């Protein structure tokens, strides 16, 4: 439910150690949580709202130019003037020009001319700025339940750095104390909220100041005084004489292609509503009751409807409707190996399954985590108990290798935040955030700023230095760096 | 002394971060009693718990009488990222401050 089949989901399970945990829940994933006791809950990021913004610059991606004046003085008296200069709205450049005899100017010797033109721009790129506070994370979380696909179960939590603690009601389940952090996630206050025509996306305080276009200086309305203005024009003098000026038209596509590194942000409005996003929440169980443990278990036929299926992470949903009994009864979920002895084998995801009863509605749908071999999934009670063959078909060392690769991507994206992703009580974890904190920080410090081919290339330059000469020390650390870069391009390949 | 002074707290302004390693907070205290005293903590752990860092202002106190009296408090969070805590044993608003370095 709410989680199954996102292909990015991740399981996290605490080993008592009190209720502690803490999982970096990340937009695009849904993190599911299971405990010894307790129900099991699914949490995913949903939408990250940036509430209040304030304007910095605008620029312009499409020029247009008005009348063109001239004002050419002869070789004697030099500089020209052109009263339409000395405005905000007229751009000018002096270009000493050909003009000896034939036409005024009783000497040779060139003679300046001032030709200017009026710059009024068509559209605005309007960069907006955000600061980490007042942004709003909205996380929705759902527990596994009878609901099959049609609410004491899923709760809606919105976590503001003005309220980093959150505690969500679940009637007959528990609180799910959420201590989130709405600040450290994305490195905001670097990102600016950038608006081309009717689109929006975030870019860095470095890229947004460095674009060479007209400035609006964050000005309001009126007839904005445009800084620069020169970079967008084109003063060219044909052969020696008659300077001409051209508009050099809309660059909208040019910023678009120059913008390859940004993430796009969905909406605008009174509030910028963006996507992706990165949160580290300290998830706190404290109050969760299973609510089913007191029920009777019900003896009745069970009839699958949707035949069970294998999710990408390997967990298997199975939907069971059944008539014939009443009461909000438990149902036996144990999967088995021999049909003879049940001998429950394989961990169950749904913890305690139950039923809403009412009439012959049923519909639970609990989901399971079968062993790496062949397995019979048996939902049933007495002699007539309905089963399904399974054959998970993934190897165990395959799963371990899987969780490692996956671990390496979480470690590649979240940087130093990988460590503490599923933190708990061990200290060696703090040593991790420390050790990868200093290598991470100094790594991003000297490099940072490295494009795809930059890091692939310098990756192999470091690996050819990896095995080129001398000692087993520096060659070793160069080979290590090269490993990290190449590995960092390889990751995020899709 | 002033007991510890207990009632609701609502952050007036989103608090601030000075350039000299400080966080400044204003609080309403939702109107209970006179010249009482309300604590605050910098808590790395849980909502509150252990106190780390240091209060640059000392003996943070409510002034007097009706509804809201704002207590502005110079606080230096630890070099990490904590959760300002306003002081009610239970009902309290909080934050997350990510001081740098």
């Amino acid at each position, epitope marked *: 439910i709410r989680c199954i089949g996102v292909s990015n989901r991740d399981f996290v399970e605490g080993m008592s150690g009190g209720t502690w945990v803490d999982v970096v829940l990340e937009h695009g994933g849904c993190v599911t949580v299971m405990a010894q006791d307790k129900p099991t809950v699914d949490i995913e990021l949903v939408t990250t709202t940036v509430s*209040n913004m*304030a*304007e910095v610059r605008s620029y312009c991606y499409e020029a247009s130019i008005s009348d063109m004046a001239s004002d050419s003085r002869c070789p004697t008296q030099g500089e020209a003037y052109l009263d339409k200069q000395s405005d905000t709205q007229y751009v000018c450049k002096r270009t000493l020009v050909d003009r000896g005899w034939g036409n005024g100017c009783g000497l040779f010797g060139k003679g300046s001319l001032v030709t200017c033109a009026k710059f009024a721009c068509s559209k605005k790129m309007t960069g907006k700025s955000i600061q980490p506070e007042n942004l709003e994370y909205r996380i929705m979380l759902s527990v596994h339940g009878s609901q099959h696909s049609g609410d004491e179960n899923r709760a809606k939590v919105e976590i503001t750095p003005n309220s980093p603690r959150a505690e969500a009601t679940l009637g007959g389940f528990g609180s799910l104390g959420l201590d989130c952090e709405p600040r450290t996630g994305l490195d905001f206050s670097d990102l600016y909220y950038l608006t081309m025509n009717n689109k929006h996306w975030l870019v860095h305080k470095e890229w947004f100041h460095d674009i060479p276009l007209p400035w609006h200086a964050g000005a*309001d309305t009126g007839t904005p005084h445009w800084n620069n203005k020169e970079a967008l024009v084109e003063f060219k003098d044909a052969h020696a004489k008659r300077q001409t000026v051209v508009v050099l038209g809309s660059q909208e596509g040019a910023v678009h292609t120059a913008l390859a590194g940004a993430l796009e942000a969905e909406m605008d409005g*009174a509030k910028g509503r963006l996507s992706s996003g990165h949160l580290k929440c300290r998830l706190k169980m404290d109050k969760l009751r299973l609510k089913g443990v007191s029920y009777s278990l019900c003896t009745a036929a069970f009839t699958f409807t949707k035949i069970p299926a294998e999710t990408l992470h390997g967990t298997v949903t199975v939907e069971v409707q059944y008539a014939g009994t009443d009461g909000p009864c438990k149902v036996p979920a144990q999967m088995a190996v021999d049909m003879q002895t049940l001998t429950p084998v394989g961990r169950l995801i749904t913890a305690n399954p139950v039923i809403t009863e009412s009439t012959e509605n049923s519909k639970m749908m609990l989901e399971l985590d079968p062993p790496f071999g062949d397995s019979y999934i048996v939902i049933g009670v007495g002699e007539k108990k309905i089963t399904h063959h399974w054959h998970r078909s993934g190897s165990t060392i395959g799963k371990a290798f899987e969780a490692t690769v996956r671990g390496a991507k979480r470690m590649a994206v979240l940087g130093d935040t990988a460590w503490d992703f599923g933190s708990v009580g061990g200290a060696l974890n703090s040593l991790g955030k420390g050790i990868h904190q200093i290598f991470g920080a100094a790594f991003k410090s000297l490099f940072g700023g490295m494009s795809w081919f930059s890091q692939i290339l310098i990756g192999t330059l470091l690996m050819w230095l990896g095995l080129n000469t001398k000692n087993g020390s520096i060659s070793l650390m160069c080979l290590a760096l090269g490993g990290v870069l190449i590995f960092l391009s390889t990751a995020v390949s899709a | 002394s002033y007991s510890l002074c207990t009632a609701a707290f609502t952050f*007036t*302004k989103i608090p601030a971060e000075t350039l000299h390693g400080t966080v400044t907070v*204003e609080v*309403q205290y939702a*109107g209970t009693d006179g010249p009482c005293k309300v604590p605050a903590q910098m808590a790395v752990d849980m909502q509150t718990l252990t106190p780390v860092g240091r209060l640059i202002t000392a003996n943070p106190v409510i002034t007097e009488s*009706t*509804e*809201n009296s*704002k207590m502005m408090l110079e606080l230096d969070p630890p070099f990490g990222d904590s959760y300002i805590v306003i002081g009610v044993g239970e009902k309290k608003i909080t934050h997350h401050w990510h001081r740098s370095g």
Partner: antibody
Amino acid sequence: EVQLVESGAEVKKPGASVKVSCKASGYTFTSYAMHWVRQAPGQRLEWMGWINAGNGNTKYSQKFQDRVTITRDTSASTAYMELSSLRSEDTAIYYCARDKVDDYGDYWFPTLWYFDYWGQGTLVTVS
Amino acid sequence: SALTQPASVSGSPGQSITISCTGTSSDVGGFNYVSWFQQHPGKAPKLMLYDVTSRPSGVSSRFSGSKSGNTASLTISGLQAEDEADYYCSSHTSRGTWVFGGGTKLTVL
């Protein structure tokens, strides 16, 4: 307590010049201040003020950037706003209020509060 | 300029009123400067704001200020009835001049 009062009800011909006095009483005309806020009944308060009684500086709303000039004198602890070339439109009430200057005596950024007190009011009407 | 403020309003005693003043980024948005000035008709205006949320000491704790984006909201509850004083919102602009909103005639029924 803090007391400000000024010239009483007064009338001027169109094109005349009003001179209103603000006599500050009950506080220290030190980290002074004063303002001038025009009001007649039924419209928006305009603020055409000035802001500095220590140094005698002034800032005017462009609105009336050059019309009013202001004299400030501690011996009488009094600020005199004088609006020259008044018009039928200006018939109004001119309050003088204060917003305390900062320690340095230079007034740039106000107190977070502005007007903790107000003049008595002077109704000025144009024929 | 001319702070947008709506002409006039009313309601049962004790009932919440909110008068919202809408400025621009030049003044109300990019500053904490706000003031709501209770002006008794016939008498001199007074203070009933100070740096938004806070209040001068002689203020009926009734009053409450708030701000979002470009807004100034004076929200009053627990009305004592005799508290309709034309409410004017005023703030310090960025240019260094003060502007007073259109004012709200307050209607006590």
